[PDB]
Write a protein that binds this ligand. Structure first.
Ligand SMILES: CCCCCCCCCCCCCCCCCC(=O)OC[C@H](CO[C@@H]1O[C@H](CO[C@H]2O[C@H](CO)[C@H](O)[C@H](O)[C@H]2O)[C@H](O)[C@H](O)[C@H]1O)OC(=O)CCCCCCCCCCCCCCCCC
Ligand SMILES: CCCCCCCCCCCCCCCCCC(=O)OC[C@H](CO[C@@H]1O[C@H](CO[C@H]2O[C@H](CO)[C@H](O)[C@H](O)[C@H]2O)[C@H](O)[C@H](O)[C@H]1O)OC(=O)CCCCCCCCCCCCCCCCC
Ligand code: CLA
Ligand code: CLA
Ligand code: CLA
Ligand SMILES: CCCCCCCCCCCCCCCCCC(=O)OC[C@H](CO[C@@H]1O[C@H](CO)[C@H](O)[C@H](O)[C@H]1O)OC(=O)CCCCCCCCCCCCCCCCC
Ligand SMILES: CCCCCCCCCCCCCCCC(=O)OC[C@H](COP(=O)(O)OC[C@@H](O)CO)OC(=O)CCCCCCCCCCCCCCC
Ligand SMILES: CCCCCCCCCCCCCCCC(=O)OC[C@H](COP(=O)(O)OC[C@@H](O)CO)OC(=O)CCCCCCCCCCCCCCC
Ligand code: HEC
Ligand SMILES: CC1=C(/C=C/C(C)=C/C=C/C(C)=C/C=C/C=C(C)/C=C/C=C(C)/C=C/C2=C(C)CCCC2(C)C)C(C)(C)CCC1
Ligand SMILES: CCCCCCCCCCCCO[C@@H]1O[C@H](CO)[C@@H](O[C@H]2O[C@H](CO)[C@@H](O)[C@H](O)[C@H]2O)[C@H](O)[C@H]1O
Ligand SMILES: CCCCCCCS[C@@H]1O[C@H](CO)[C@@H](O)[C@H](O)[C@H]1O
Ligand SMILES: CCCCCCCS[C@@H]1O[C@H](CO)[C@@H](O)[C@H](O)[C@H]1O
Ligand SMILES: [Ca+2]
Ligand SMILES: [Ca+2]
Ligand SMILES: [Cl-]
Ligand SMILES: [Cl-]
Lengths: 176, 243, 52, 342, 37, 153, 137, 97, 153
C-alpha cells in the first residue's frame, strides 16, 4: 500500500521534482552516511586497550579516556577528504541536525501537496517543448511516464470515480 | 572470399563492391530476353546541404557537412526489373531492398540535418540504343522521399499523427492557433532525382560500377519546419542478370 | 567490451579443449616449479607472509 | 651505467617516499597515483559536458536528448546523457569516432566520465586503506566505503552489462536519475524486491540511528561552558577525557525502552552504527546488480482468486497498474515488437 | 585521432607502471610500527 | 510479417530506421528495434541467415526453415526475465508461468558471492597488513604515530 | 460467485450439443494449459502472434470453427491457419508434431478435452479480461 | 489549413469498414475466411478503384472469390493515404494487444 | 455569468503549482465572457456529456458519455483501432446562453477543441495577451493562504 502511495505521488504530484523532497532525500542519505562513517571511524581509530584480537572487551563504561583517537581520526580524514571533524560535540550535534532537518523539509513539501501545490512543471521547459517538437530532456521524458501512471492506474486506484477509459484513449508508445 | 568474421567491425560492411581497373568492357543486351538488376548498392561518400541565405537573390550553394551517425549510410540488396524499351533504352524499376537509411549530418556551426537517404520506388532509364552497357551508359530517374518519421512517431510531448495527443497538454488553457504547426502533424511525400554514371563494366559477369549524384529534401519533422535541399554523391555497384 | 568479450567470447569446442590442454600443462609445470623453488627476493619484499 | 643505477635508484626511492608521505596535506599514495588523473579527467569532462554538450541520441533511434545548460536545461533537468543504444556495450573512446561532432552525438562523454569515475572511486577506496596503514590505524574504513562504491558500480556498470547497453546506465543528472528509477520500477518491480527493502531499512535506519546517537551524546555533554557560550567550546581537540557522560546517556536510553536494549559498550555501539547502513547499502547494491540479470521483485499480480476464479485485486495489483503506465510510455518510439526483453 | 590514441596509451601505461612498481617497492615496510616487513 | 507479405528490407520504422533490419555502426545488417544493442549475438539457429555483410536479405526471404521459426519462438518466450517467486515474464506479467531462467539464477548467485568475496578480500587483506605491522588491535596509547608527525598546517 | 455446472457447460460440437465438465476436468485443463500452452497463450492472448487470441468469439470465426470442444481438440491434433488453408503443425505444438514439440507427447484424448474445456470456460469467468492483454491486467 | 489526415480518414468509410486500400491487415480477422491467405493477396494487390475490383486479383481460387463476394458488404475503398501505407504499416502498424 | 464562472476548474484552488507565481489571470487569462453552455450530440442526436477533470489530474482525456454513463465518443490516442472518434460518431456541439448562444459547430477539430475546454466545466473567453498569460493554472488567495499558514503552523 505504501509502495502504491510512492508511485501515486510520482504520477500525480511529480514529487521527485520537488526541492523539499530533495532536501529530505539529502538528509536521509546524509544521515545514513554520517552513521556509517562515524561508526567506522571510531572502530578503526581505537586505542589498543586490551590484548584480545576481538576488541570489544577492551572498553570500560566508567573510564575517563576516549576509547578512540580523535587526533588520528582528524588527520586521516583531513588527508583523505580535505576536511575532518575536530570537535566531538559539533560532530554529534551535526549527526542530529542533518536527518532531523531533512525530514522536516520533506514534511513542508507534503503540506504543499495537500493542496496540489506541486513542483510539477518548469514553465520555460513547457513553452519550448510545445513550440519545438525536437526539444527533449529528461524532464519531458518523466512527464510522459507520469501521464502513463495516471491513465493506467486511476480506474482501479480511484474506483469511486467510475472511470471507464476506452482502450483507444490510453497513452502508449509504439508496440508496448 | 571474405566471411562475416573477416568483415565484422571493419567498416567494410558499409562499402559497396568494386570492380577492377581492367573492367572497361561491354555487357551485351538481347532485346528479346528479359533482365533484372539482382543487386544494386549505393554508398554515399559526400553529403552536401544547400545553404539558406537571407538575401532572396544570393544564389545559394551546397556546402559540406560532417556525418555524425557513423557507417550506417549505404543502400544495398536492391533488386528490380531491367526493361528493354522500344528505343533500346533500359528502364530500371526498383522492386525491393534496403533502399533507405536515416542519416544525420552536421553543418558548420552545429546545425544537424537529418534526412531519409533513399531511392524508394526508383524508376531510372538510360539513353536510347543501349545495345550494350558500357562506360558510356548513364541512368537518370526519380524516386519517392516519404516522411523521415512514419505516422506512429511521437514528439517529446507525446503528440503524433497516427497516435499521440493532438494538443499541447502541458499548456491546458493556451490558445491553440499559434501552436497549430507543432500540434497538427503532417506526413511529407516528395520527389528526389538521381543520376548513375557507369564507370566500369564486366561484360562477362554483368557487373557494373560507377558514381552517383542524387538530390532530395531532408527531414521536415512531420511538418514542424521547412526541409533542406541535400545533394548526395557516392559510388554504386550493380549486377545485371537475365530473368 | 561489446563485440569482443575477452575469454567469454570462446565460441567453439576446439578452442575450449585446446585451452584446457594449455592450462593443464601450465598448472603442472607451475606446480613443479613451486615444489623446486623458493620465492625470489622481489616477491619476498612485496607480499605479506601469513595465513590470513 | 655503473653507480648511475644507484643515482636512479635513490631518486626512485625519494619519489616513493614523497608519494607515500604521511606529511602531504592531501595524501597521495600509490592508489592516488591512479585516482588523481582519472578523477580530474572525469570531473573536467563532466563539467564541460554538463554546461555545453549538444543533444545525445541515447536510445539509438536518432532522437537526441538535450542534457546541457546551454542547450535549454536548468540544474534539475540537466544531465550528461548515456551513450547510444546503437553502441550497446561497445567501447567508444574519442579515437573510435570520426570526429568530436560524431562522438558528442553518440554520447561519448558519458563513457569517458563513468569509466574514469569508477576507476577513481575504486582507487579512492584503496587509498582509504593505504593511509590507514601509513597512520597505524585499523584498516576497515575502506570496507564501509565499499558500500557506496558498490552502489555506483551497480548503476553505471553492472546494470548496463546485464541489459546489454550503457544506454540503460543511470544518467549523470538529477532528472535523469528519476527517469532511471521509474523505468527500473516498471521493468523490475524493485519496490517489491527484498534487497531494496533492506536498502530502505539501511538508510531510514541509518538516518534514525544518526539522529539517535547524535541526540544521546549531545544530551549528556558535561557542563564546561556558560549559557552565553556554545557548548561546543566545552570540548578541546585532542583532550584525553571523554566529553559526555555515557553512564547518564545509557541511563536515559535504557529507561526510554528497557535497560538491555541500550548500548553501554561504546565500541559495540559504534560497530552497530557502521554495520547497519553499510550492510543495507550492500544489499541494495546487490539488488540493482541482480535485477541487472532480470531476477526481479516479488510478483503477486493476480495472486488472490475467489471461489469462481475471479481475481480479487490487492495493493500489489494497483502497483502493477502504475508499472504498466510507465512501461507502455517509456521510450515511446523505441519498441517495434510486443515484449520489452531488455 | 590516432595521435590522441597513442598519447592516451602512453599516459595510461605511465601511471599504471608507477602504481605497479610503487607497490613493489617494499610497501609492507612503509608503516609507522614494524618497518622490517 | 514477411509471411503476411511485408518486404522486411524496405520497411521503414517510426524513427526512420528499419523496423526489422538496419545497420550496425560499422555497416553490418542487423535486427532492428531495441535489439540493435544485441547485434554481437551469435547462435546456431541464426547463423544460417548471416552472410559476409551481416543478415542476408535473400536468405531471409527464401531460406528460413520451420525449425528456425520454432527455435526463435521458443527462445523469445523463454527470455531470462522473471520474479523472485519464479513468475516468468516481465515485471507486469500476471501469474501463470512458473519460470526463472537458469542463466538468471546462476548469474545473480555468483554476482552476490563474488561481491562479498571482494569485501572479504578487502577485510582480510587490510587485517593481514595491520596484524603483520602490529597494530590490528588498535593504536598504542604511549606511542601513537600521529602524535610524532608534524601538523598538516 | 461459484464455479457452477452451468458455467462448466460448454459447446461440444458445432451442432449445438453441450457437455458439462467436471470441476476436476476444468482444473486438470487449467494445469495442462499452463504446462503446454501458457508460455505463448497466458491469459488468452498469443505472444508470438498477438493478432490471434483465444476469445470464444474469435474461435467461432476461425475455419473450421474452434468455439467448441471437438474443434479445439482437432486443433491440438492438426492446427491450421485462421482460414483453415494451411496446416501449421511444423511451427505450432500438436499431437501431429509431438516429435518436435515434446510437451505434447503422452497427451491423451481426455487431456485435450480438458485443455479445450479450460479455454471455453475461462472467458465465462473472466469476460473481456480473457484475451484482453495488459490493458486488462 | 493544417489537418491531421488520419483523423480526417476516420470520417470516411475507412472509419466504418475495412478499407482495401488503407486498413492494416489485422482487421481482416474480423470476418470468417479472410486471414491470412486472402488478406495477404488483398494488401499486395492494392489499390482498388472499387470494392468489386478485389474479385479480379490474379490467381484467386473459385472458393476465394465466393468468400470475397460474401464479405464485400464489409469492405470499402477510399483514396490511398500515404501516412497509413508507408513504413510497411499495413503489415504491422505498431499495435499489438 | 458569475454563477457559470464558479463552475469552471480554473477557479478551483487545488489546480495550482508551488512555483506558478502570481494571479490566476496569469494562467488561463483574464476572463472576458461566458461562451455559453456547450451541448454535445452525436449523429443520432443523443446528448453526450464530457467527463470533467478531477482536481488530481494535470492532464485528462476527452471522453463523452450518454446520460447513463455509457461511453459514446472520445478523442483517441492510437487511431488504428479507434471506434469512438468524433468523426466516426458525428459529434456536434451547440451553445445556449453566452457569446455563442444559438450557434452549432460540426467541423470535428472545432468540436474537439470545445470538448477539451468542457473537461474544465463551463467555457469562457479569456484575454491571454494583456498579461502574456501562459495557459497553466494557478491557485487563488484561498490556496496561498492555506499553504502559508499550514506550513507556519
Ligand atoms: C589485478 C586485476 C584487478 C582488477 C583490475 C580490473 C581491470 C579491468 C576491469 C574490467 C571491468 C569491467 C569492464 C566491462 C566488462 C564487461 O562488459 O563484461 C562483459 C564481458 C562479456 O562481454 C560480452 O561477450 C560476448 C561474447 O559472446 C559472443 O560469443 C558467445 C559464444 O558462445 C555467443 O555466441 C554470444 O552470442 C556472442 O555475442 C559478446 O562479445 C558481447 O558483445 C560482450 O558484451 O564479460 C567479460 O569480459 C568477463 C568479466 C568482466 C569482469 C566484470 C567485473 C565486475 C566487477 C564488479 C565489482 C562490484 C563492486 C565492488 C565494490 C567494492
Ligand atoms: C522471510 C524472513 C527472512 C529472514 C532471514 C532468513 C534468510 C533466509 C531466507 C530464506 C527463505 C526461506 C523460505 C524459502 C522457501 C523457498 O525458497 O521456496 C522456493 C523453493 C521451493 O518452492 C518451489 O519453488 C519453485 C521455484 O521455481 C523453480 O521451479 C519451477 C518449477 O520447476 C520452475 O522450473 C522455475 O523456473 C524455477 O525457478 C516453484 O515455484 C515451485 O512451484 C515451488 O514449490 O525452494 C528453493 O528453491 C530453495 C532455494 C535455496 C537456494 C536459493 C538460491 C538463490 C540464488 C540467488 C541468489 C541471489 C538472490 C537475490 C534476491 C534474494
Ligand atoms: C594458484 C596459482 C599460483 C599462485 C598463487 C602463485 C604464486 C606465486 N608465484 Mg607462481 N606460477 C603458477 C601459479 C601460481 N603461482 C603457474 C601455473 C606457473 C607456470 C606459468 C607459475 C610460474 C611462476 C614463475 C616463473 C614465478 C612464479 C612466482 C610466484 C610468486 C610471486 C607471484 C607474483 O608476484 O604475482 C604477481 C604478478 C606480477 C607481479 C606481474 C604483474 C601482474 C599485472 C600487473 C596484473 C595483471 C592483472 C590482469 C587482470 C590479469 C588477467 C588478464 C591478463 C592475463 C591480460 C608467488 C608465490 C615468482 C617466484 O618467486 O617463483 C619462485 C616467479 O618468478 N610463478
Ligand atoms: C549457486 C547457488 C545456487 C543457485 C544459483 C541455485 C538455483 C536454484 N535452485 Mg538451488 N540450492 C542451493 C544453491 C543454489 N541454487 C543450496 C545451497 C541449497 C541447499 C539449501 C539448494 C537447494 C535447493 C532446493 C531444495 C531447490 C532448489 C531450487 C533452485 C531453483 C529455484 C531457486 C529459488 O526459487 O530460490 C528462491 C530464492 C531464495 C530462497 C533467495 C535466498 C537469498 C539469500 C538468503 C541471499 C543472502 C545470502 C548472502 C550470500 C549472504 C550475505 C552475508 C551477510 C552480509 C548477511 C534455482 C534453479 C528449486 C528447484 O527448482 O529445484 C529443481 C528447489 O526446489 N535449490
Ligand atoms: C502569508 C504569506 C503570504 C501569502 C499566502 C501571500 C499570497 C499571495 N501573494 Mg503576497 N507577499 C507576502 C506574503 C504573502 N503573500 C510578503 C511577506 C511580501 C513581501 C515580499 C509579499 C509581496 C507580494 C508581491 C510583490 C506579490 C504577491 C502576490 C501574492 C499572490 C501570489 C503568490 C505567489 O505567487 O507565491 C509564490 C510562492 C512561492 C514561489 C513559494 C516560495 C517558497 C520559499 C522560497 C521557500 C524557501 C525555503 C527555504 C530557502 C529552505 C531553507 C531550508 C533550511 C532551513 C535548511 C498570492 C495571493 C502576487 C500578486 O499577485 O499580487 C497582486 C505579487 O505580485 N505578494
Ligand atoms: C531582506 C531582503 C530579503 C530579500 C530576499 C529576496 C528573495 C529571495 C527569495 C525569493 C523566493 C520567491 C521566488 C518567487 C519567484 C518570483 O518571481 O515570485 C514573484 C511573485 C509575484 O508573481 C508575479 O506576479 C506578477 C503579477 O503581479 C506576474 O504574474 C509575474 O509573472 C509573477 O511572477 O512574488 C511573490 O509571490 C512573493 C510572495 C510569496 C508569498 C508566498 C507565501 C508562502 C510562502 C511560505 C514559505 C515557507 C517556507 C518554509 C521553509 C523552511
Ligand atoms: C557478513 C557481512 C559483514 C558484516 C560485518 C561488516 C560491517 C563492516 C562495517 C565497516 C567496518 C566496521 C568495523 O571496523 O568493524 C570492526 C569490528 C571489531 O573489530 P575487531 O578487530 O574487534 O574484530 C574483528 C576481527 O579482528 C576479529 O576479532 O569488527 C567486527 O565486529 C566483526 C563482526 C563479524 C561478526 C560475524 C561475521 C558477520 C556477521 C554479519 C551480521 C552482523 C550484524 C551486526 C549488527 C548489524
Ligand atoms: C582527493 C581529495 C578530494 C577533495 C574533494 C573536495 C572535498 C570538498 C569537501 C567540502 C569542502 C567544503 C566544506 C565547508 C564546511 C567546512 O569547512 O567544514 C569544516 C568542519 C570542521 O569541523 P570542526 O569539528 O572542526 O568544527 C567544530 C566547530 O568549529 C563548529 O563551530 O567540518 C564539518 O563540519 C564536517 C561536516 C560538514 C561536511 C560537509 C561536506 C560537504 C560535501 C559537499 C556538498 C556540496 C556539493 C555541491 C556540488 C555542486
Ligand atoms: C508459442 C510457441 C505457442 C504455444 C506454446 C502454443 N501456441 Fe497456440 N498459437 C500460437 C500461434 C502463433 C498461433 C497463431 C497461428 C496462426 O498462424 O494462425 C496460435 C493459435 C492457436 C489457436 C487458434 C486461435 C484462434 O483464434 O483461432 C489455438 C486454439 C491455440 N493456439 C491453442 C493452443 C493450445 C491449446 C496450446 C497448448 C497445447 C498452444 N496453443 C500452444 C502460438 C503458440
Ligand atoms: C582454458 C580455456 C582457455 C584458456 C585460458 C587460459 C590460457 C588462461 C590463462 C590465464 C592466465 C595466464 C591468467 C593470469 C592471471 C594473472 C593475474 C590475475 C595477476 C595478478 C597480479 C596481482 C594480483 C598483482 C598484485 C600486485 C600489484 C598489482 C602491485 C605490486 C604488489 C602486488 C604483487 C600485490 C580459452 C580462453 C582459450 C578458452 C576457454 C577454455
Ligand atoms: C606490468 C608490469 C609487470 C612488472 C612485473 C615485475 C616483476 C618483478 C620485478 C620486480 C622489480 C621491482 O624491484 C623492486 O624495486 C624496488 C625499487 O627499485 C626495490 O626497493 C624497494 O624495496 C626495499 C626493501 O623493502 C625498500 O627498502 C626500498 O625503499 C624500495 O625501493 C625492491 O626491493 C625491488 O624488489
Ligand atoms: C572551453 C571551450 C568549450 C567548447 C564550446 C563548445 C564547442 S564549440 C561551439 O559549438 C557550437 C555548436 O556546434 C557552435 O554553435 C559554436 O559556434 C561553437 O563556439
Ligand atoms: C475555433 C476553435 C478554437 C476557438 C474555441 C476554442 C475553445 S474556447 C477558447 O479557448 C482558449 C483557451 O482557453 C481561450 O484563450 C479563448 O479565450 C477561447 O476563445
Ligand atoms: Ca561513364
Ligand atoms: Ca503570449
Ligand atoms: Cl523514458
Ligand atoms: Cl523492439
Amino acid at each position: 500500500a505504501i509502495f502504491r502511495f510512492l508511485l501515486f505521488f510520482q504520477g500525480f504530484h511529480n514529487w521527485t521534482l520537488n526541492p523539499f523532497h530533495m532536501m529530505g532525500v539529502a538528509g536521509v542519505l546524509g544521515g545514513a552516511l554520517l552513521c556509517a562513517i562515524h561508526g567506522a571511524t571510531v572502530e578503526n581509530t581505537l586505542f589498543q586497550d586490551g590484548e584480545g584480537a576481538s576488541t570489544f572487551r577492551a572498553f570500560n563504561p566508567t573510564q575517563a579516556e576516549e576509547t578512540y583517537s580523535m587526533v588520528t581520526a582528524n588527520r586521516f580524514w583531513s588527508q583523505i577528504f580535505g576536511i575532518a571533524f575536530s570537535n566531538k560535540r559539533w560532530l554529534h550535534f551535526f549527526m542530529l541536525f542533518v536527518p532531523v532537518t531533512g525530514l522536516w523539509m520533506s514534511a513542508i513539501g507534503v503540506v504543499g501537496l495537500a493542496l496540489n501545490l506541486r513542483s510539477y512543471d518548469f514553465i520555460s521547459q513547457e513553452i519550448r517543448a510545445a513550440e519545438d517538437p525536437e526539444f527533449e530532456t529528461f524532464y519531458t521524458k518523466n512527464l510522459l511516464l507520469n501521464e502513463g501512471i495516471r491513465a493506467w492506474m486511476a480506474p482501479q486506484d480511484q474506483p469511486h470515480e467510475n472511470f471507464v477509459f476506452p482502450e483507444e484513449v490510453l497513452p502508449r508508445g509504439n508496440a508496448l | 572470399t571474405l566471411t562475416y568474421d573477416d568483415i565484422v567491425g571493419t567498416g567494410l560492411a558499409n562499402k559497396c563492391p568494386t570492380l577492377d581497373d581492367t573492367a572497361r568492357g561491354a555487357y551485351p543486351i538481347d532485346s528479346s530476353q528479359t533482365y533484372r538488376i539482382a543487386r544494386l548498392c549505393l554508398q554515399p561518400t559526400t553529403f552536401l546541404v544547400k545553404e539558406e541565405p537571407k538575401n532572396k537573390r544570393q544564389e545559394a550553394e551546397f556546402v559540406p557537412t560532417k556525418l555524425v551517425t557513423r557507417e550506417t549510410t549505404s543502400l544495398d540488396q536492391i533488386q528490380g526489373e531491367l526493361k528493354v524499351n522500344s528505343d533500346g533504352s533500359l528502364t530500371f524499376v526498383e522492386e525491393d531492398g534496403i533502399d533507405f537509411q536515416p542519416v544525420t549530418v552536421q553543418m558548420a556551426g552545429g546545425e544537424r540535418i537529418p534526412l531519409l537517404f533513399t531511392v524508394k520506388n526508383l524508376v531510372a532509364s538510360t539513353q536510347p540504343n543501349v545495345t550494350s552497357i558500357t562506360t558510356s551508359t548513364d541512368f537518370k530517374g526519380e524516386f519517392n522521399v516519404p516522411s523521415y518519421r512514419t505516422a506512429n512517431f511521437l514528439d517529446p510531448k507525446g503528440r503524433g499523427l497516427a497516435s499521440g495527443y493532438d494538443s499541447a497538454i502541458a499548456l491546458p488553457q493556451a490558445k491553440e492557433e499559434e501552436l497549430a504547426r507543432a500540434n497538427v502533424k503532417r506526413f511529407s511525400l516528395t520527389k528526389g532525382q538521381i543520376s548513375l554514371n557507369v564507370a566500369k563494366v564486366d561484360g562477362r559477369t554483368g557487373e557494373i560500377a560507377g558514381t552517383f549524384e542524387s538530390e532530395q529534401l531532408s527531414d521536415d519533422d512531420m511538418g514542424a519546419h521547412e526541409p533542406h535541399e541535400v545533394k548526395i554523391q557516392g559510388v554504386f555497384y550493380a549486377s545485371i542478370e537475365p530473368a | 567490451f561489446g563485440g569482443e568479450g575477452w575469454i567469454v567470447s570462446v565460441n567453439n569446442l576446439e578452442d575450449v579443449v585446446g585451452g584446457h590442454i594449455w592450462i593443464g600443462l601450465i598448472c603442472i609445470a607451475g606446480g613443479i616449479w613451486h615444489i623446486l623453488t623458493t620465492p625470489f627476493g622481489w616477491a619476498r619484499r612485496a607480499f605479506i607472509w601469513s595465513g590470513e | 651505467t655503473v653507480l648511475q643505477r644507484r643515482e636512479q635508484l635513490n631518486l626512485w626511492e625519494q619519489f616513493c617516499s614523497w608519494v607515500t608521505s604521511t606529511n602531504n596535506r592531501l595524501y597521495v599514495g600509490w592508489f592516488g597515483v591512479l585516482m588523481i588523473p582519472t578523477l580530474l579527467a572525469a570531473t573536467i569532462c563532466f563539467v564541460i559536458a554538463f554546461i555545453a554538450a549538444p543533444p545525445v541520441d541515447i536510445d539509438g533511434i536518432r532522437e537526441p536528448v538535450s542534457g546541457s545548460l546551454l542547450y535549454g536545461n536548468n540544474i534539475i533537468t540537466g544531465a550528461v546523457v548515456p551513450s547510444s543504444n546503437a553502441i550497446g556495450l561497445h567501447f567508444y573512446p574519442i579515437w573510435e569516432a570520426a570526429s568530436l561532432d560524431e562522438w558528442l552525438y553518440n554520447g561519448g562523454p558519458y563513457q569517458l566520465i563513468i569509466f574514469h569515475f569508477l576507476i577513481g572511486v575504486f582507487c579512492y577506496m584503496g587509498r582509504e586503506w593505504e593511509l590507514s596503514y601509513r597512520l597505524g590505524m585499523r584498516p576497515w574504513i575502506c570496507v564501509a566505503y565499499s558500500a557506496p562504491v558498490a552502489a555506483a558500480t551497480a548503476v553505471f556498470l553492472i546494470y548496463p552489462i546485464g541489459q546489454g547497453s550503457f544506454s540503460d546506465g543511470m544518467p549523470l543528472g538529477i532528472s535523469g536519475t528519476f527517469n532511471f528509477m521509474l523505468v527500473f520500477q516498471a521493468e523490475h518491480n524493485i519496490l517489491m524486491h527484498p534487497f531494496h527493502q533492506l536498502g530502505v531499512a539501511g538508510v531510514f535506519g541509518g538516518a534514525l540511528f544518526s539522529a539517535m546517537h547524535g541526540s544521546l551524546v549531545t544530551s549528556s555533554l558535561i557542563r564546561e561552558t556558560t549559557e552565553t557560550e556554545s557548548a561546543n567550546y566545552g570540548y578541546k581537540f585532542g583532550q584525553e577525557e571523554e566529553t559526555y557522560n555515557i553512564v547518564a546517556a545509557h541511563g536515559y536510553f535504557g529507561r526510554l525502552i528497557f535497560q538491555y536494549a541500550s548500548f553501554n559498550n561504546s565500541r559495540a555501539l559504534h560497530f552497530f552504527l557502521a554495520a547497519w547502513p553499510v550492510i543495507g547499502i550492500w544489499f541494495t547494491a546487490l539488488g540493482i546488480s541482480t535485477m541487472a540479470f532480470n531476477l526481479n521483485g516479488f510478483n503477486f499480480n493476480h495472486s488472490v482468486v475467489d471461489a469462481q476464479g475471479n481475481v480479487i485485486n490487492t495493493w500489489a495489483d494497483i502497483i502493477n497498474r502504475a508499472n504498466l503506465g510507465m512501461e507502455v510510455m517509456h521510450e515511446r518510439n523505441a519498441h517495434n515488437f510486443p515484449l520489452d526483453l531488455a | 585521432m590516432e595521435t590522441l590514441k597513442i598519447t592516451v596509451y602512453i599516459v595510461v601505461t605511465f601511471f599504471v607502471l608507477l602504481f605497479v612498481f610503487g607497490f613493489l617497492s617494499g610497501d609492507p615496510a612503509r608503516n609507522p610500527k614494524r618497518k622490517d616487513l | 510479417d514477411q509471411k503476411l507479405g511485408a518486404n522486411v528490407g524496405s520497411a521503414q520504422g517510426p524513427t526512420g530506421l528499419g523496423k526489422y533490419l538496419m545497420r550496425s555502426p560499422t555497416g553490418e545488417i542487423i535486427f532492428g528495434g531495441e535489439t540493435m544493442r544485441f547485434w554481437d549475438f551469435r547462435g546456431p539457429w541464426l547463423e544460417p541467415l548471416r552472410g559476409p555483410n551481416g543478415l542476408d536479405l535473400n536468405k531471409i526471404k527464401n531460406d528460413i526453415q520451420p525449425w528456425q521459426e520454432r527455435r526463435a519462438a521458443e527462445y523469445m518466450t523463454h527470455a531470462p526475465l522473471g520474479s523472485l517467486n519464479s513468475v516468468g515474464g516481465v515485471a507486469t506479467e500476471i501469474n501463470s508461468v512458473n519460470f526463472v531462467s537458469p542463466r538468471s539464477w546462476l548469474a545473480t548467485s555468483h554476482f552476490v558471492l563474488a561481491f562479498f568475496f571482494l569485501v572479504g578480500h578487502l577485510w582480510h587483506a587490510g587485517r593481514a597488513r595491520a596484524a603483520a605491522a602490529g597494530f590490528e588491535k588498535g593504536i598504542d596509547r604511549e606511542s601513537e604515530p600521529v602524535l610524532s608527525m608534524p601538523s598538516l598546517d | 460467485a461459484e464455479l457452477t455446472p452451468e458455467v462448466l457447460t460448454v459447446p461440444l460440437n458445432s451442432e449445438g450439443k453441450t457437455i458439462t465438465l467436471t470441476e476436476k476436468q476444468y482444473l486438470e485443463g487449467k494445469r495442462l494449459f499452463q504446462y503446454a500452452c501458457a508460455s505463448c497463450h497466458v491469459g488468452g492472448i498469443t505472444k508470438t502472434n498477438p493478432s490471434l487470441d483465444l476469445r470464444t468469439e474469435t474461435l467461432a470465426l476461425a475455419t473450421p470453427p474452434r468455439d467448441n470442444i471437438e474443434g479445439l481438440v482437432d486443433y491440438m491434433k492438426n492446427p491450421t491457419t485462421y482460414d483453415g488453408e494451411q496446416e501449421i503443425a511444423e511451427v505450432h505444438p500438436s499431437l501431429r508434431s509431438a516429435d518436435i514439440f515434446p510437451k505434447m507427447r503422452n497427451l491423451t484424448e481426455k487431456d485435450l478435452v480438458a485443455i479445450a474445456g479450460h479455454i471455453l470456460v475461462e472467458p465465462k469467468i473472466l469476460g473481456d479480461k480473457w484475451g484482453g492483454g495488459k490493458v486488462y491486467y | 489549413e493544417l489537418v491531421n489526415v488520419v483523423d480526417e480518414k476516420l470520417g470516411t468509410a475507412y472509419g466504418e469498414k475495412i478499407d482495401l486500400n488503407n486498413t492494416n491487415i489485422a482487421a481482416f480477422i474480423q470476418y470468417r475466411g479472410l486471414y491470412p491467405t486472402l488478406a495477404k493477396l488483398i494488401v499486395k494487390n492494392a489499390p482498388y478503384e472499387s470494392v468489386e475490383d478485389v474479385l479480379n486479383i490474379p490467381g484467386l481460387t473459385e472458393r476465394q472469390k465466393q468468400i470475397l463476394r460474401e464479405n464485400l458488404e464489409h469492405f470499402t475503398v477510399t483514396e490511398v493515404e500515404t501516412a497509413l501505407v508507408e513504413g510497411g504499416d499495413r503489415y504491422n502498424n505498431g499495435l499489438y494487444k | 455569468e458569475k454563477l457559470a464562472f464558479y463552475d469552471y476548474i480554473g477557479n478551483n484552488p487545488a489546480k495550482g503549482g508551488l512555483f506558478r507565481t502570481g494571479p490566476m489571470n496569469k494562467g488561463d487569462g483574464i476572463a472576458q465572457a461566458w461562451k455559453g453552455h456547450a451541448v454535445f450530440r452525436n449523429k443520432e442526436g443523443e446528448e453526450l456529456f464530457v467527463r470533467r477533470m478531477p482536481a488530481f489530474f494535470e492532464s485528462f482525456p476527452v471522453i463523452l458519455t450518454d446520460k447513463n454513463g455509457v461511453v459514446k465518443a472520445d478523442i483517441p490516442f492510437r487511431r488504428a483501432e479507434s471506434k469512438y472518434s468524433f468523426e466516426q460518431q458525428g459529434v456536434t456541439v451547440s451553445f445556449y446562453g453566452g457569446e455563442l448562444n444559438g450557434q452549432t459547430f460540426t467541423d470535428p477539430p472545432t468540436v474537439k477543441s470545445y470538448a477539451r475546454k468542457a473537461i474544465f466545466g463551463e467555457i469562457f473567453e479569456f484575454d491571454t495577451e494583456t498579461l502574456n498569460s501562459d495557459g497553466i493554472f494557478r491557485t487563488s488567495p484561498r490556496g496561498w493562504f492555506t499553504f502559508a499558514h499550514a506550513v507556519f503552523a
